Ligand binder design. Structure first.
Ligand code: HEM
Ligand code: HEM
Lengths: 145, 145
C-alpha cells in the first residue's frame, strides 16, 4: 500500500532527501523550471499533456509554466516536511495522486520524472545515492497510481 | 486587475503578513483544518463544493480533508514566499485561480474565507490589523477569478 511505501523510507534515506532538498529547494523558481524543461527535452512525448501551459519552449518567460513550476516545488516541500509522519505523508501524496489520475497519468509515466530529478541533483553535485533516495520518494506516489 | 491588486501589498502589509504567518504557518495541519472546519461551520452553503472530501464534519479524522488542508497551507506559504517579486506572485496566484474557476468558485464566494482567517488569527492573538492585511492578499486571488 501507499502506507507501506511511506513506512519504508529509512532514517538514512530521509537524511539524504533533506540534505539535498536544502539545496535544490532553495531556488524553487530556477530548479522547478529546470525540472520541467528537462522533462520536455528528454521526454518530448509528454509535451501534449501540458497544453494548458501554452508554449513550454519559452521557459522562464512563460508565466503559466513558471507558475506551474514554482507550485510543483511546493508539493515537494510538502512531502519533505511530512517525512517523519507516514500518516500525514500518505494523505498529501494521495491528494496529489488524484490530480494526476484525473489527467490519466499512470504510475509508469509519473516515474519519467526520475531522469530530470537525477540531472537537476547532479547539477548541484548530488550523486547516484541521492538520486536513488528521490526515486524512493517518487515510488510512494507511484503506489497511489 | 491582479497587477493593481498586487500593488496594494505595501511594505507595511507585507510585514504584517510575514509576522503573522510565522505563527499560523508553524502548524499547517492544525491551522489548516481549523480554517476549513470554520468555513464549513459559518458558511454551510459551501459544503456542496467539497463533495470529493466526503464527510467534512469529521474534521481531522477525515484523511481527505486533512490532505486537502495541509496542501492549502502550502499554497499560502507559496504566496508569502513570492511577496518580494510581484511578477512571480501573480503567476502563482493565477495558477491557483484556475483551480477554483474550474470548480465554479466566484470572487465573492472565494472571499468567504476572510471570516475564517480572521477567526483563526484571533485565536492566536492577531487582531483586525492582521485580518485586514490577509484580506488584501485574498483580494489578489479574487482579482483573478
Ligand atoms: C515529482 C513529480 C511530480 C510532482 C510533484 C507533480 C506535481 C504537480 C502539481 C502540484 C500539479 C498541479 C495540480 C493541479 O493544480 O491540478 C501538477 C499538474 C500536472 N502534472 Fe504533475 N507532478 C509531477 C510529475 C508529473 C509527471 C512526470 C507528469 C507527466 C508525465 C505530470 C503531469 C501533470 C499534468 C498533465 C498536470 C496538469 C497540468 C495543467 O494542465 O495545469 N506530472 N503536477
Ligand atoms: C485562502 C484561500 C484559499 C486557498 C489558498 C485555497 C487553496 C486551494 C488548493 C491548494 C486547492 C487544491 C487544488 C487542486 O488540487 O485542485 C483547493 C481546492 C478547492 N478549493 Fe480552495 N482555497 C481557498 C479558498 C476557497 C474557498 C473560499 C472555496 C469555496 C467557497 C474554495 C473551493 C475549493 C474547492 C471546491 C476545491 C476542490 C476540492 C476538491 O474537490 O478536492 N477554496 N483550494
Amino acid at each position: 500500500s501507499v502506507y507501506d511505501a511511506a513506512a519504508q523510507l529509512t532514517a538514512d534515506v530521509k537524511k539524504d532527501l533533506r540534505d539535498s532538498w536544502k539545496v535544490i529547494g532553495s531556488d524553487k523558481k530556477g530548479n522547478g523550471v529546470a525540472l520541467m524543461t528537462t522533462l520536455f527535452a528528454d521526454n518530448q512525448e509528454t509535451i501534449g499533456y501540458f497544453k494548458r501551459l501554452g508554449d513550454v519552449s519559452q521557459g522562464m518567460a512563460n508565466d503559466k509554466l513558471r507558475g506551474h513550476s514554482i507550485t510543483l516545488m511546493y508539493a515537494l516541500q510538502n512531502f519533505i516536511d511530512q517525512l517523519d509522519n507516514p500518516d500525514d505523508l500518505v494523505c498529501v501524496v494521495e491528494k496529489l495522486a488524484v490530480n494526476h489520475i484525473t489527467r490519466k497519468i499512470s504510475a509508469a509515466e509519473f516515474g519519467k520524472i526520475n531522469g530530470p530529478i537525477k540531472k537537476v541533483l547532479a547539477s548541484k553535485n548530488f550523486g547516484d545515492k541521492y538520486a536513488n533516495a528521490w526515486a524512493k520518494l517518487v515510488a510512494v506516489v507511484q503506489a497511489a497510481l
